[PDB]
Ligand binder design. Structure first.
Ligand SMILES: N[C@@H](CCCCC(=O)O)C(=O)O
Ligand SMILES: N[C@@H](CCCCC(=O)O)C(=O)O
Ligand SMILES: N[C@@H](CCCCC(=O)O)C(=O)O
Lengths: 277, 277, 277
């Protein structure tokens, strides 16, 4: 798809792009943006309006291109896996995310000293991906600790990410989900699926609709709809699971609808049983 | 109980209450508060002094009433479950919690653009419950990551909530506890009880005094005093546990004093054994 | 070792040290620092330049001494366990870590009211240890949620601490590691070791090089190099593990190189098997 947006980029003295903010997708409007253009000599950066036009099927070719792809996900214009992100790691700079804005890692000790004349400097994060909410707050969502959702995450209307929840880029919820556990990069869960406190979804892997992962559970295989994983149980692709009298690698049960995975005291095994109903 | 307090409320142009701060319980004093009254045209809100009087046994009837109930818990005036919170979810607005204060979710993209003339906008959270510490810091406590304690939490003198700890509203510690795991809404633990790193207490459920939950353990049943749950073990109400030679649902062991729950290599079962001493 | 540095300390009206920042180790230079000296009457503190000289083998004797020891760790001048920290808990004050800087816990409700004339007050943490990154950002690292690394942590070049990661003081990574789980105080992991999401390393305990802890795993024993612990499995020192046909307490397997710890469906036991290769 051809996608375009006008945004405002933070650039170092040497032209490295620390960030770009696109408040809207597909708009040539600048009036939100012209008053934010300027130089910050304490951070040694310039903020400048840019217009970015990409082919979402092509691999990104520069930092601006990469930042628009992340915005397209979090604005929910594209779902996870529907936009090419190949090489994005090589295009994003590591950045010190402060209360004054993005700062370069190179020379940060001098930057901090300079900014400290203006007030207390707080560092929120040091990373190549910023906190999603500082760029887009999508409609119909709650996030308890907004450190834990990266820009590039897709959170559908009706989603709550609790404080224990975590959503990486190119990942998230396709419908209304309670997320109290970790959605890895490249993982999606569908409508009605609830991820229990401290649960881990590895990621290749997705879950369908109305699944329930218990607190401190884990899922290393794709599942379909209406599956349950008991609290405290980690189903890896290599976990041995008893189903209809034979032991299978859990990968053999990948994609299933309507299974409950639980410990079984009678066999001593992990078991998968039908979910009724 | 009749409870009353004077506070300062943030109101939208249409009268929705984004927050109320009650610095003290039971005081008619305003001198902390009159200089904070005003309008913020970038957030399109007004901050106004209010006096709120409630019956703690009655269900809350408006947003102001709901916010005082949360303050009464975090100020430790009322313990969890001793104040009626029925319907509170329907009375609290979802709010964007920023470094500039609460903002409405409706029109937030315009609000952000307006505030950005003043400085970098950071969103801490998007939720109906704010971070407790921005309203009350109770005496004798430490909180590592204060994103992870909601207003409405009760933390008794001597409590440390470590970074991995989480305490929801209507929940917390009744005495001195080390909290490195998740205390769900409606859960309490009593004096001396320590919740290990990444442990999960579901919640109906409480723990008594001097209990020890190992790292990455779970507890889905009420327990009494001096119980231990081994690291990595999740005791759900349906978990089968061997005690005095029979297999029980762990719910049959609910309320016990002095039990250790651990994996047993000899039986292959979860076992509960006496804690000596 | 004799270690010395010039820093700037925040002192209460009664002389309690809330913090000290040493921007550099071993320098008599003040030019970063003289403009930050002053009084803040809303917090009732003074910020003053200090020069601190210690013997790293001696127990710390005052708050200044304690804060330099933490900086020496995070600046990576000293590795964990190579600097005496005995009694440090008794020398650090509990502090309210705000967007305005450190505040005393005594009288904090008045302080908050005073600061609120200047703008929204946000409390990041309440603790004796601050967030490392507000004092030192070491080179070559990423930290997703910088609430979760305490000052006193040692993070070697090439380390990423993901959002689920946590690193305490006197703890961390000796080489390039992906940290998505909890490194307790006094725990180190060596080069190449990756700590999976939600994994717990207790701490006495270290891991060697190229170890892999699966998501939601636990490790309560020291291990050497090239060990793996399966996702969802907690190896405590008392866990019974089958190795070469006998059941051992996992403590008997402490220090091993090249072992995989996993659940075994054939025996019903935890098993340790050779890592090939
Ligand atoms: N696989 C983990 C950690 C890698 C994230 C990407 C990174 O290192 O930046 C997760 O997806 O949650
Ligand atoms: N049961 C979980 C999540 C629901 C919290 C309330 C909510 O959705 O806001 C806990 O108590 O920690
Ligand atoms: N043992 C835990 C909690 C204690 C930390 C020190 C404290 O209470 O401040 C950890 O090391 O992560």
């Amino acid at each position: 798809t051809t996608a375009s947006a006008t945004g405002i980029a933070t650039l170092t003295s040497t032209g490295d792009v620390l960030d770009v903010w696109y408040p809207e997708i597909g708009s040539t409007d600048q009036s939100a943006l012209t008053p934010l253009e300027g130089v910050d000599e304490d951070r040694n950066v310039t903020r400048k309006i840019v217009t970015t036009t990409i082919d979402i099927d092509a691999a990104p070719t520069d930092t601006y291109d990469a930042w628009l792809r992340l915005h397209l996900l979090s604005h929910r214009v594209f779902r996870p896996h529907t936009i090419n992100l190949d090489g994005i790691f090589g295009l994003l700079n590591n950045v010190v995310w402060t209360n004054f804005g993005p700062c370069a890692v190179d020379g940060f000790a001098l930057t901090r000293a300079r900014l400290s004349r203006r007030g207390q400097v707080t560092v929120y994060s040091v990373d190549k991906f910023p906190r999603m909410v500082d760029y887009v707050v999508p409609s119909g969502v709650r996030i308890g600790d907004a450190d834990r959702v990266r820009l590039g995450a897709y959170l559908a209307d009706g989603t709550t990410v609790m404080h224990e929840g975590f959503v990486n880029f190119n990942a998230g919820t396709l419908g209304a989900s309670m997320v109290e556990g970790r959605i890895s990069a490249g993982v999606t869960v569908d409508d009605g699926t609830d991820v229990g406190g401290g649960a881990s979804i590895m990621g290749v892997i997705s879950l369908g609709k109305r699944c329930l992962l218990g607190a401190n559970s884990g899922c290393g295989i794709p599942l379909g709809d209406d599956c349950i994983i008991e609290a405290g149980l980690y189903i890896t692709a290599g976990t041995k699971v008893l189903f209809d009298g034979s032991l299978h690698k859990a990968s053999t049960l990948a994609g299933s609808n309507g299974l409950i995975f639980r410990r079984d005291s009678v066999s001593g095994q992990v078991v998968a049983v039908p979910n009724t109903k």
